[PDB]
Design an enzyme around this catalytic site. Structure first.
Site, short mmCIF file in Angstrom:
data_model
loop_
_atom_site.label_atom_id
_atom_site.label_comp_id
_atom_site.label_asym_id
_atom_site.label_seq_id
_atom_site.Cartn_x
_atom_site.Cartn_y
_atom_site.Cartn_z
N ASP A 35 0.96 -1.18 0.03
CA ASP A 35 0.05 -0.02 0.12
C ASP A 35 1.14 1.36 -0.16
OD1 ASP A 35 -1.86 1.91 0.39
OD2 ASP A 35 -2.70 1.23 2.45
N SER A 199 -1.01 16.08 -12.08
CA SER A 199 -1.35 15.43 -13.35
C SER A 199 -1.73 16.63 -14.39
CB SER A 199 -2.67 14.28 -13.43
OG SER A 199 -2.88 14.12 -14.82
#
Length: 330
Positions: A35, A199
């Protein structure tokens, strides 16, 4: 030194990926969920409440000659989905695909929520976010990656997740045969303790690319892609019959429909997620309504680039002094 381990999907939907991890002496092998959105290494153990264990392999520190109780230390964690776990802490030897760390904090679960009990395939989690998120009190502990950093040839780990297939987690080296073209690196912010990046935009299917800043985290422990409501409505508007259902808790679409692809920007590069990766099958067995892989982040508070997005690329987690994230097509 280096490490290399295979990661396998737990089911036919790629809901989670498990990687075998060796804990203690002699080794006890547990299948852990890697994770990058958390920083605790916690396992089901001989201390976990007997009613909260349903088929998992447990770590037994009394059978390990290198296990030591970390006197007084406790941990308590709650995840974004509402799941939780808590208990005491041991130190022990931990190895991942040949890479060994001595004196790693291993959080032994005493209590686990029902979400974990139901998943018999997952024996625990191995946190790979920054050590600032570790929940050990009063003395915060380091992650496996932070502890291994000095021994590694390069302070990096790579994630190469498979689509309905096994993949690889490498530590200390970049496999130049696992990707095509070049790797685009992007800046990471460590302010919240996550692999947080920006992004540069998106495109739906064969549509025009829209340049817009989407801040989010690279999270291997989250199954789906969670983006702002504007982006998500623009994607599902292209699927005939798609709608947001309050009963289901997200966007659903007719199982007979073909899904368009989704492109996300990484600097000047583009990563294309094929439409099939966004199909998560029927909401219930025999149903004609299918669950979508792109959902809204509105109720979460943070945009998450989960397994749906990450499995479409070769991903570099560069843990150098100035951390960076690398993306390449594969």
């Amino acid at each position: 030194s280096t490490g290399s381990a295979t990661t396998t999907p737990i089911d036919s939907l790629d809901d989670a990926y498990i990687t075998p991890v060796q804990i203690g002496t002699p080794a006890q092998t547990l299948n852990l969920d890697f994770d990058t959105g958390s920083s605790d290494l916690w396992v089901f153990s001989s201390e976990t409440t007997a009613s909260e264990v349903d088929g998992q392999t447990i770590y037994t520190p009394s059978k390990s000659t290198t296990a030591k109780l970390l006197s007084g230390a406790t941990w308590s964690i709650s995840y974004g989905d509402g799941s939780s776990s808590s208990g005491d802490v041991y130190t022990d030897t931990v190895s991942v695909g040949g890479l060994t760390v001595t004196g790693q904090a291993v959080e032994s679960a005493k209590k686990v929520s029902s979400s974990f009990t139901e998943d018999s395939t997952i024996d625990g989690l191995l946190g790979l976010a920054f050590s600032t998120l570790n929940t050990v009190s009063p003395t915060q502990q380091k992650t496996f990656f932070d502890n291994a950093k000095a021994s590694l040839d390069s302070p990096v780990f790579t994630a190469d997740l498979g689509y309905h297939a096994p993949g690889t987690y490498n530590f200390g080296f970049i496999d130049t045969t696992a990707y095509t073209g070049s790797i685009t690196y992007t800046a990471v912010s460590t302010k919240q303790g996550f692999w947080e990046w920006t992004s540069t935009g998106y495109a739906v299917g064969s549509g025009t690319f829209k340049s817009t800043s989407i801040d989010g985290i690279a999270d291997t422990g989250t199954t789906l892609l969670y983006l702002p409501a504007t982006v998500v409505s623009a994607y599902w508007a292209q699927v005939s019959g798609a709608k947001s259902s309050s009963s289901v808790g997200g966007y659903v679409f007719p199982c007979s429909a073909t899904l368009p692809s989704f492109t996300f920007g990484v600097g000047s590069a583009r990563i294309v997620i094929p439409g099939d990766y966004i199909d998560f099958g029927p909401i219930s067995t025999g149903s004609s309504s299918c669950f979508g892989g792109i959902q809204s982040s509105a109720g979460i508070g943070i945009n998450i680039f989960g397994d749906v997005a990450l499995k479409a690329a070769f991903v570099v987690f560069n843990g150098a002094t100035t951390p960076t994230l690398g993306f390449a097509s594969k």
